[PDB]
Design a protein around this ligand. Structure first.
Ligand code: CLA
Ligand code: CLA
Ligand code: CLA
Ligand code: CLA
Ligand code: CLA
Ligand code: CLA
Ligand code: CLA
Ligand code: CLA
Ligand code: CLA
Ligand code: BCR
Ligand code: SF4
Ligand code: CA
Lengths: 91, 29, 80, 41, 732, 66, 150, 194
């Protein structure tokens, strides 16, 4: 099998993310909210979210989303690539 | 023969250490 | 020195004051019980911490408590 | 004497009880020794 | 402040010798220090952590330096089977001429100590070959130890100190420790294996000078990114392979053969490279679960809040439990120690059965040493885990903020927990002792057939499930028509089945009725020690005898003789009690391990199997029997090389018994004795020219139990170590 | 009216720090005097660590039980 | 059950053999018609009877030559563990149930401790045989088994 | 009461459909939970109604067994077949992907519902014949569905259990085996010994 498998999986995953599971995933994120120690965590902490990097022009998706779905995509794909050549045989 | 670091660790360091601790401990600022 | 407290649970029996070997407690007027008196720890500098006071309190839970604190010559019971 | 009966049933009640138990156990063993299992079912 | 210890004014105003004693034992209890803040608390710990790492790096640096400078290693590499590894050199002017003769072993030029930690097998397996390798390694750790001190000093400076909320950023730390500290570290370790370790076991030396223009594999990284990873398992090392040489050497770098390398009797290097590579994935992907600054991830708090079973059988479940742990460093230390204590025992039980280092299994003294080493470490760690648990309940536990959650309900039904632990301990104790004594009487009356020897068929059934041919049973992996067998058929199973059924190795050893009894002893030891510790934790804040045991803290002497008497009523004191039991428990564990193994190495598992069922057998055939060469270390006729172990053996007995003084005799006796000596000094001419600056007093009530326990423990550890090493190494 | 629980009545302790905590006992008398912090003297069938069978309690520290 | 039945174990036979020779050896000094001799011959006869029963009751033996017990639940060895055990739990339950019958009879009375250090033997003898049907404690459990206050 | 003389739990007033007041564990004490349950029972039932026929009909023909069909998947290449014809889409990876992708989408779609998952009675394109036009009539049908669904779930089970023990599975077949000699062939023989 070729490198093409990577693309379909990653493509489908991305697709899944953008149009199927996208609304639900966000709903959950809103409810979960960000971590808070006694409340919020930015209060000391130097470190806080990056609002700008988070923001994107597409009607819904963001760059970070791309990263995760793509990763699942690549992983699932590489998962299929390896199980192929193992030629593992069971009863 | 470097094995003559033994007394230094073996005795000298301990004596200095003890004397110093003793002094710090009995100090009255 | 040690820390010694009293509580309104005290019934004015006065036993601890009688129990103390170093004269730490004493009784003072009060109106929270029929005895109309309550213990006091005005000289905790002389206390040793033997808890003979506690050993003599009949309140359900001790009304006089001794919290062993910083050690002094007086509290260490030293004659030297 | 009521009272004598009263001395009894004290911890002498324990020894009379355990001596009886010891006897019973001993006789059982004398009768059925070296038993590692219950073989009657 | 004014004088030591100046982290505590009230203790410096002590006119007695107690100020010095207590000044040392409270130096790390930062929370009890004067003017302490939450800011200074986290900063002091953080700094101490770098100090600790610096010492660790420095410590290992010392071992490397000394092995290279005073040890053979190179000589050991050529003959692993027939060369004794050298710990370091012995320079002692007290040494008589004989002692210098008797001790110069291992082909050294002078008297040396023989290493039993097993760093030789470790470094040989790891890839290290010559002394030059060891030196540069020692340099590297000396360097790492410096930058540890340097970093510890840096974050104590005002412009680099971290805020408390930074320390309380849990999700970030977890995302990094799982992904980076566990994952990437493991990933990069497998890198060392396929680059240096594996090729080194195949004769080719890959160091920094030539690890760039040299391939770890012929196809060289092509198949990895291609997806056909199977190529890396195409040609493993042969069954006739010789370690360090090309005779039988393969090309594979990632396999799953299972079992052992025939020559070295250790796990395949190609099995371990694969292991860490596979590990690094679950860890790398695992460290992306919690939320940081990218709008994705979990709120650990929100998960706990959401885990409340309806019908409220756990009340409010895990609500508020996030802050309960994140605010309390003791809760975190307790969790840390408990987890660490378990995998410390896991390491012990796995390294004797499944050796990972070349030629380590043949070294019986090292195998015995390492196992006993970790089981005592694990044991001590376990009691500490159950010490900070109590400390948490006293110092950090907030009742209102944990209202009706799983943590609170523990205290709510504490009597039920404690009573059942008491029942389990009583049940195990009454019968394990009962059966041991019954069997001793039978042996006494000369009728061993009357013994009660219960076969451990449950555990025998487990071993069968693993594929052990003994006992029969026809269980999974022990049966030809088993879906589990045919599933793993010719992957790891041929290597595994071969190894589990080899009669030499310690891979799932045969067990019998003697193994049954000791395990219940072990079960007894665990339940009792836990019973002591959790009764201590759950009663730390109070009882009926002392409703307000809080307000008095973790460690206090008592509450006086009133209300019946209250000695050893503090949570610190049941810790003190539990250590004894944990020492007893680990003692049973290591007795069991060492006897089973010396009889195995001796080819006489019969002696263990027939003598471990009655307690006289343990005394006579294990302790009395193996003490022969040990106690003859020195003699009215001669001294041996085992003389040092004979000396230490008594030393252990001495320290042990010396501790009995502090534990049996208590303070009031010694206070009255000292004040008569205070009189003497002042009334002695020429001597009263010299006056003491600190008033001499008896050790305090708690201090006594600490000093006593330390002696008892030191004696315990030093006595068994003298016996373990000597009886083993004397025979090997 | 009369101030506290009847005399014959048995009560359940709510002190927490009391030996007879979630247990019961019978009230002997009730000091009728205001200002008195803890009246409602009670006696128990079983003795405490200090060998005493009676103690005084606050009004809100006792629940009538039947 | 990696063992072999005792009936067909050589080691088990060697032990019976060796034991009898040891006792017979002692037999020599005492001559015949004698008290010790009869005592030793009685131990020998008690020895033979012992080994005979173990084999007879199908008990496995180990390489050691000594019987070993199966407590797994296997039906061929209930005699080894399960049968005696139930017997125990019956008695243990009996003792405990009778002991608890006494305290409840004693509890609402005068000075209750007086009958805990000085036993009311008439009352005890009245309650001892109630343990015979103690597993009808179960039917108390359906109602008044344990206290609700705690 | 549908246990003859047993008081009905508080929540079940027998108004629900298929409500026979059976809940010995009271897993329905919580209203939020029960509602979820009502939805699930129907789901589980709907499948089951589908599955028995799925399993039963082919066997009447060339199915041999529901189990047997699964047999090809294990070996490489399959390819498996529906009616003597391999493919289309014969291999396991293709089917697995098609299933996972096709399914996940349909169900998740469910996980975007309010109004009680449209009362677990969506009735959109689903009730074309619009049986649910009539409320009185609609109710009767629900009872039919649940009773039928329950009947189906119960049967599936027996198939699995029967399938167990008799790895020579013959759900339809066993029955024969029962028919032949019903007296000496029954589960009884299976509950006991050789
Ligand atoms: C690592 C620590 C250490 C070291 C290096 C030594 C070394 C020595 N010990 Mg000591 N010892 C120690 C720990 C140590 N010990 C401990 C812990 C104990 C308690 C159990 C003892 C108890 C002990 C006893 C009872 C004796 C020794 C003796 C000796 C000497 C025997 C060798 C010999 O005969 O040569 C040469 C013999 C000589 C007499 C040469 C003398 C050395 C010159 C005078 C040194 C000059 C003094 C020195 C500079 C002052 C110290 C300054 C320093 C503290 C700053 C040797 C110097 C023996 C000894 O010293 O003989 C009397 C002896 O009797 N040791
Ligand atoms: C598979 C479905 C899918 C996926 C995976 C993406 C992914 C992405 N889109 Mg896109 N988009 C989609 C469908 C999709 N879109 C559809 C159907 C429309 C029209 C309805 C758009 C209209 C759109 C716009 C206008 C933009 C994106 C942008 C982006 C990128 C976000 C910004 C960025 O990457 O860098 C930061 C990201 C690669 C942004 C972009 O192009 O980045 C420069 C951008 O501005 N999208
Ligand atoms: C003084 C010495 C002495 C002597 C010579 C005996 C002799 C005997 N005892 Mg006694 N016994 C003694 C002391 C003695 N005992 C003491 C001190 C106690 C404890 C108080 C007992 C408690 C005891 C019990 C409980 C029993 C005996 C029984 C027996 C008889 C065995 C019956 C039989 O046929 O076996 C076989 C019986 C089968 C059922 C088979 C035997 C006559 C048994 C008996 O006869 O019952 C009345 C019986 O079970 N004994
Ligand atoms: C991660 C590891 C870890 C850490 C960071 C801590 C940290 C702490 N512990 Mg814990 N503890 C641990 C593990 C740990 N412990 C384990 C494994 C156990 C079981 C043994 C305990 C049992 C324990 C108890 C009972 C107590 C603590 C206490 C404390 C606090 C005060 C420490 C202090 O200043 O005293 C300083 C310690 C010393 C100065 C050491 C002197 C005594 C040692 C044991 C003797 C050295 C051994 C001996 C000399 C060996 C040489 C022999 C020779 C012949 C070779 C501090 C927060 C105390 C506390 O709760 O605060 C009030 C407390 O009382 N710990
Ligand atoms: C931290 C771990 C560690 C430990 C437990 C030891 C332990 C020991 N060393 Mg080593 N040493 C170490 C690190 C360590 N060393 C490091 C990092 C170096 C520099 C590479 C050395 C250099 C060294 C020399 C030259 C000698 C020893 C010797 C010894 C032995 C006698 C003690 C002594 O003379 O003082 C050690 C002296 C030092 C300079 C160590 C200090 C280095 C850091 C700061 C600690 C003793 C076994 C002596 C020996 O072999 O006995 C016969 C000896 O002659 N050590
Ligand atoms: C060999 C000495 C020894 C023995 C036998 C014990 C035994 C026990 N310990 Mg102790 N312990 C010891 C040393 C010992 N400990 C030491 C040195 C310390 C450090 C101070 C401790 C600290 C300690 C703590 C903190 C605790 C225990 C507990 C227990 C009990 C645990 C449960 C159990 O085993 O049930 C079985 C009972 C036994 C094994 C002892 C029974 C002895 C015989 C078999 C009874 C039969 C008598 C027989 C009829 C003969 C009668 C003689 C006649 C004159 C009347 C058990 C009684 C725990 C406990 O109380 O459990 C709930 C508890 O929490 N131990
Ligand atoms: C380790 C956990 C465990 C537990 C809790 C049990 C429990 C039981 N086993 Mg089992 N067993 C086990 C492990 C276990 N076993 C292992 C590892 C093996 C491998 C040999 C066996 C082999 C085995 C056999 C061959 C049998 C049992 C039987 C039994 C039952 C006998 C009690 C009875 O008759 O009813 C209670 C009686 C009264 C209350 C009176 C009981 C349920 C027996 C059984 O099946 O019961 C009919 C039996 O035949 N077991
Ligand atoms: C036979 C049992 C049975 C019964 C009595 C019902 C009854 C009902 N269903 Mg249901 N359904 C069933 C099985 C059943 N269903 C199965 C097995 C599935 C798929 C797993 C579904 C999927 C389904 C959906 C998605 C919906 C319903 C709805 C309804 C309600 C209106 C439609 C109707 O009455 O159907 C009339 C009864 C029949 C037409 C008899 C069917 C027999 C034919 C010949 C099929 C045979 C096919 C063959 C075996 C394959 C009504 C209560 C709707 C609803 O609740 O409205 C809001 C709705 O949305 N059903
Ligand atoms: C209600 C649906 C249903 C129907 C129509 C059948 C029908 C049948 N079953 Mg089955 N069975 C069922 C459910 C059902 N079963 C369930 C839910 C289980 C799991 C407990 C089983 C477990 C089972 C076994 C082990 C066996 C059967 C067997 C049989 C056949 C003979 C009857 C018998 O042996 O025992 C009577 C049926 C029962 C005891 C199950 C009770 C179910 C009813 C509804 C009550 C017959 C075709 C036997 C067979 O295959 O022929 C030799 C066989 O040995 N069944
Ligand atoms: C898969 C597998 C398995 C598994 C198993 C498991 C599931 C496991 C486990 C396990 C476990 C299950 C473990 C455990 C543990 C534990 C511990 C060891 C504990 C502890 C603790 C502590 C010490 C605590 C403390 C505290 C307190 C007390 C208070 C509060 C706080 C704290 C928490 C800190 C088996 C083998 C079957 C088979 C093979 C494979
Ligand atoms: S403790 Fe001893 S000294 Fe201090 S008050 Fe109570 S009685 Fe007096
Ligand atoms: Ca083996």
């Amino acid at each position: 099998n070729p490198s093409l498998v990577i693309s379909l999986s990653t493509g489908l995953s991305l697709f899944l993310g953008r149009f199927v599971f996208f609304n639900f995933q966000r709903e959950n994120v809103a409810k979960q909210g960000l971590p808070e120690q006694n409340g919020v965590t930015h209060f000391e902490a130097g470190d806080s979210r990056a609002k700008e990097y988070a923001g994107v022009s597409k009607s819904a998706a963001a760059l970070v989303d791309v990263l995760a779905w793509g990763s699942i995509g690549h992983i699932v794909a590489y998962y299929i690539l390896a199980t192929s050549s193992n030629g593992y045989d069971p009863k | 023969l470097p094995s003559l670091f033994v007394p230094l660790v073996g005795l000298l360091f301990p004596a200095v250490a003890m004397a110093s601790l003793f002094l710090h401990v009995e100090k009255r600022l | 020195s040690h820390s010694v407290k009293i509580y309104d649970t005290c019934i004015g029996c006065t036993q601890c004051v009688r129990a103390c070997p170093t004269d730490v407690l004493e009784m003072i007027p009060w109106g929270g019980c029929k005895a109309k008196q309550i213990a006091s720890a005005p000289r905790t500098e002389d206390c040793v911490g033997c808890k003979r006071c506690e050993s003599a309190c009949p309140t359900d839970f001790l009304s006089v408590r001794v919290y062993l604190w910083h050690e002094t010559t007086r509290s260490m019971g030293l004659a030297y | 004497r009521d009272l004598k009966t009263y001395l009894s049933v004290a911890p002498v009640a324990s020894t009379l009880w355990f001596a009886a138990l010891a006897g019973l156990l001993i006789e059982i063993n004398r009768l059925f020794p070296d038993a590692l299992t219950f073989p009657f079912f | 402040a004014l004088r030591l210890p100046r982290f505590s004014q009230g203790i410096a105003q002590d006119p007695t010798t107690r100020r010095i004693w207590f000044g040392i034992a409270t130096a790390h209890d930062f929370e009890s220090h004067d003017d302490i803040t939450e800011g200074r608390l986290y900063q002091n710990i953080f700094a101490s952590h770098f100090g600790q790492l610096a010492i660790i790096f420095l410590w290992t640096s010392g071992n490397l330096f000394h092995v290279a400078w005073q040890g053979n290693f190179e000589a050991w590499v050529q003959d692993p089977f027939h060369v004794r590894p050298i710990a370091h050199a012995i320079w002692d002017p007290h040494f008589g001429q004989p002692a210098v003769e008797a001790f110069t072993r291992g082909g050294a030029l002078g008297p040396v100590n023989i290493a039993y930690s097993g760093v030789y097998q470790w470094w040989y397996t790891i890839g290290l070959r010559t002394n030059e390798d060891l030196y540069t390694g020692a340099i590297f750790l000396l360097f790492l130890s410096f930058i540890s001190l340097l970093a510890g000093w840096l974050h104590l400076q005002p412009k680099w100190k971290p805020s408390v909320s930074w320390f309380k950023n849990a999700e970030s730390r977890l995302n990094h420790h799982l992904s980076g500290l566990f994952g990437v570290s493991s990933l990069a370790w497998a890198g060392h294996l396929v680059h240096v370790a594996i090729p080194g076991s195949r004769g080719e030396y890959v160091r920094w000078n030539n690890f760039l223009d040299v391939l770890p594999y012929p196809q060289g990284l092509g198949p990895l990114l291609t997806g056909q990873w199977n190529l890396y398992a195409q040609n493993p090392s042969s069954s006739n392979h010789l370690f360090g040489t090309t005779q039988g050497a393969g090309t594979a770098i990632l396999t799953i053969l299972g079992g052992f390398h025939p020559q070295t009797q250790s796990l395949w290097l190609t099995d371990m490279a694969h292991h860490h590579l596979a590990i690094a994935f679950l860890f790398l992907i695992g460290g992306l679960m919690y939320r940081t600054n990218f709008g994705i991830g979990h709120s650990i708090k929100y998960i706990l809040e959401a885990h409340i079973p309806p019908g409220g059988r756990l009340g409010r479940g895990h609500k508020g439990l996030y802050d309960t742990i994140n605010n309390s460093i003791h809760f975190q230390l307790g969790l840390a120690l408990a987890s660490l204590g378990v995998i410390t025992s896991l390491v012990a039980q796995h390294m004797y059965s499944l050796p990972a280092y070349a030629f380590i299994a043949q070294d019986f003294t090292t195998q015995a040493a390492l196992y006993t080493h970790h089981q005592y470490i694990a044991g001590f760690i376990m009691t500490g885990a159950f010490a900070h648990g109590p400390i948490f309940f006293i110092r950090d536990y907030n009742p209102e903020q944990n209202a009706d959650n799983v943590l609170a309900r523990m205290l709510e039904h504490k009597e039920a927990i404690i009573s059942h632990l008491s029942w389990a301990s009583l049940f195990l104790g009454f019968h394990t002792l009962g059966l041991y004594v019954h069997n001793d009487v039978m042996l006494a009356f000369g009728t061993p057939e009357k013994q009660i020897l219960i076969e451990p068929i449950f555990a025998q059934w487990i071993q069968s499930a693993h594929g052990k041919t003994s006992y029969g049973f026809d269980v999974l992996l022990s049966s030809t028509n088993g879906p589990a067998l045919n599933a793993g058929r010719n992957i790891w199973l041929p290597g595994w089945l071969n190894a589990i059924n080899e009669n030499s190795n310690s891979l799932f050893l045969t067990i019998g009725p003697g193994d049954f009894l000791v395990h219940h002893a072990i079960a007894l030891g665990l339940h009792t020690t836990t019973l002591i510790l959790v009764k201590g934790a759950l009663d730390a804040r109070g009882s009926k005898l002392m409703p307000d045991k809080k307000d008095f803290g973790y460690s206090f002497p008592c509450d006086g003789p009133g209300r019946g008497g209250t000695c050893d009523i503090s949570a610190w004191d049941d810790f003190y009690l539990a250590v004894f039991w944990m020492l007893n428990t680990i003692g049973w564990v290591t007795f069991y391990w060492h006897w089973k193994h010396i009889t195995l190495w001796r080819g006489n598992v019969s002696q263990f199997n027939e003598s471990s069922t009655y307690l006289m057998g343990w005394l006579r055939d294990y302790l009395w029997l193996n003490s022969s060469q040990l106690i003859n270390g020195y003699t009215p006729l001669v001294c041996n090389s085992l003389s040092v172990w004979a000396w230490m053996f008594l030393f252990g007995h001495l320290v042990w018994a010396t501790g009995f003084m502090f534990l049996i005799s208590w303070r009031g006796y010694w206070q009255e004795l000292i004040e008569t000596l205070a009189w003497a000094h002042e009334r002695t001419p020429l001597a009263n020219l010299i006056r003491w600056r600190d008033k001499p007093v008896a050790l305090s009530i708690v201090q006594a139990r600490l000093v006593g326990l330390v002696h008892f423990s030191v004696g315990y550890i030093f006595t068994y170590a003298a016996f373990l090493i000597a009886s083993t190494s004397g025979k090997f | 009216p009369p101030i506290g629980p009847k005399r014959g009545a048995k009560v359940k302790i709510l002190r927490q720090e009391s030996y007879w905590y979630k247990g019961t006992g019978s009230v002997v008398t009730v000091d009728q005097d205001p200002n008195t912090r803890y009246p409602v003297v009670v006696r128990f069938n079983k003795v405490n660590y200090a060998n005493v069978s009676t103690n005084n309690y606050a009004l809100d520290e006792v629940e009538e039980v039947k | 059950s990696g063992l072999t039945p005792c009936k067909e174990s050589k080691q088990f036979a060697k032990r019976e053999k060796q034991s009898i020779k040891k006792l017979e050896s002692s037999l020599k000094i005492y001559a015949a018609d004698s008290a010790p001799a009869l005592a030793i011959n009685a131990t020998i006869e008690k020895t033979k009877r012992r080994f005979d029963n173990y084999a007879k009751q199908g008990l496995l033996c180990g390489a050691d030559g000594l019987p070993h017990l199966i407590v797994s639940g296997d039906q061929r060895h209930w005699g080894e563990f399960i049968t005696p055990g139930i017997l125990f739990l019956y008695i243990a339950g009996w003792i405990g149930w009778v002991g608890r019958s006494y305290l409840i009879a004693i509890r609402d009375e005068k000075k209750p401790t007086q009958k805990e250090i000085i036993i009311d033997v008439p009352l005890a003898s009245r309650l001892v045989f109630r343990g015979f049907s103690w597993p009808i404690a179960a039917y108390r459990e359906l109602l008044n088994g344990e206290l609700v206050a705690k | 009461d549908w246990m003859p003389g047993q008081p009905r739990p508080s929540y079940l007033d027998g108004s629900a459909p298929g409500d026979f007041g059976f809940d010995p564990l009271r897993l329905g004490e919580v209203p939020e939970n029960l509602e979820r349950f009502k939805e699930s029972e129907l789901i589980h039932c709907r499948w089951a109604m589908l599955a028995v026929p799925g399993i039963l009909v082919p066997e009447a023909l060339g199915l041999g067994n529901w189990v047997k069909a699964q047999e090809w998947a294990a070996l490489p290449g399959g390819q498996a077949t529906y009616l003597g014809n391999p493919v289309p889409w014969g291999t396991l990876p293709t089917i697995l992907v098609i299933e996972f992708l096709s399914i996940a989408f349909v169900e998740h779609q469910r996980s975007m519902e309010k109004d009680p998952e449209k009362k677990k009675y969506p009735g959109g394109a689903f009730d074309p014949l619009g049986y649910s036009k009539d409320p009185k009539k609609f109710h009767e049908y629900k009872i039919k569905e649940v009773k039928n669904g329950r009947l189906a779930l119960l049967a599936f089970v027996g198939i699995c259990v029967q399938q167990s023990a008799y790895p020579g599975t013959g759900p339809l077949e066993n029955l024969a085996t029962h028919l032949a000699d019903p007296w000496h062939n029954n589960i009884g023989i299976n509950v006991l010994i050789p």
